[PDB]
Amino acid sequence: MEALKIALLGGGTVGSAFYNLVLERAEELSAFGVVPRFLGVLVRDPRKPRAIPQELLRAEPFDLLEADLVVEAMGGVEAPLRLVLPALEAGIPLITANKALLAEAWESLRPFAEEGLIYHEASVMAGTPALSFLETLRGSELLELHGILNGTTLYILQEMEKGRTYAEALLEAQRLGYAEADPTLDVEGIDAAHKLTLLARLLVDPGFPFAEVEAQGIARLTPEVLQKAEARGERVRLVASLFGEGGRWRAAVAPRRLPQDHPLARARGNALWVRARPLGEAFVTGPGAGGGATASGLFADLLRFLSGAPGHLPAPRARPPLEEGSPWPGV
């Protein structure tokens, strides 16, 4: 029974949920001949009440080179990047939920992702199978991809449809744990843009640039706009789309008017929908945010690592779209 040394970067909601999940599920790890042992837990706020042993709290960066795995969920881009690089360079895998880091620091991280060292199922739709879903979709050639990827904006739009104001909805989303103190990334559609970029890279273009995604949020939406849409038998949702145009892949995030019965319009939780040849049309749904939900994704990748499987690999090569896609009508 050798130890599975884990260096955890981030003691927030997600990090805490993950730490506790690993210890709670220790017997599942035993089936693999290992017992989990955390080298330390880096925390931004060492005084915030936590369910992590005091002796493991680290207010300052610590040596990660002796870890078997580095798990990161601290948000932000530059600091996490500088912290994980040394480990990745040492050949230590990185399990992360940081969609911002992967989307904006791909120039530095791609090389390691290319050699299967980065596991990031939790980076898109939390623990819901989004990346593994596309890995299986590789059996076909993508025709079009559309998803409602942000938990906060989805909740807000759902609540406004019920008559709740933008503000009441947002504050509740924060109380519920879906959104952070400053949900600006979420409501401006940037978080969805981060995730869409990750999906594009795994399926059609390993070097897809985050800067090419055109993104807009829900800031102009009101209960009035949503009720008028309902009157026409449509639902408004912030959709992240990947489709062909002029022979090149185009990615955009924007509110779209969807038929009320469309899978994306009637989904429970966030959702990813695709049309591919020859499979056809398929889609997956589940929670897109939350401490427990995200922890499930990180733990899923830890088990994937223990099984001997590589991390999530970028698409083998860039491939053009098989057909021009027709975007949904914008709001």
d(C-alpha 166, C-alpha 168), whole Å: 6
146 strand-pairing partners = 241, 273
Q: Are 286 and 149 in contact (CB under 8 A)?
A: no
Select from 102, 103, 151, 156 the least CA-distant residue to 127.
151
Binding site for Mg ion (CB under 5 A): 68, 114, 121, 124-125, 128, 130, 297
Tokens, residue 237:
């949702």
Tokens 């997956």 sit on residue: 284
Question: Is 294 annotated to bind ligand?
Answer: no
d(C-alpha 235, C-alpha 219), whole Å: 16
Question: How many CA atoms lie within 13 Å of 181's alpha carbon, on the beta-carbon side?
Answer: 3
The sign one gets for the Cα dihedral 50, 52, 55, 58 is negative
- Least distance (Å) from a second copy to the CB of residue 234? 17
What does 109 bind: a second copy, Mg ion, none (CB cut-off 5 to 8 Å by kind)? none
- Least distance (Å) from Mg ion to the CB of residue 254? 22
What does 68 bind: Mg ion, a second copy, none (CB cut-off 5 to 8 Å by kind)? Mg ion
Residue with smaller CB distance to Mg ion, 46 or 116: 116
- Least distance (Å) from a second copy to the CB of residue 128? 5
Element containing residue 81 per DSSP (H, E): helix 78-89
Binding site for a second copy (CB under 8 A): 17, 21, 25, 27-28, 31-32, 116, 121, 126-129, 132-133, 135-141, 263, 266, 268-269, 276-287, 290-293, 295-301, 303-304, 307-310, 313, 316-317, 319
Annotated binding site for L-homoserine: 180
Annotated binding site for NADPH: 11, 13-14, 44-45, 48, 50, 99, 177, 180, 290
Annotated binding site: 10-15, 24, 44-45, 48, 50, 99, 121, 124, 126, 128, 141, 177, 180, 290
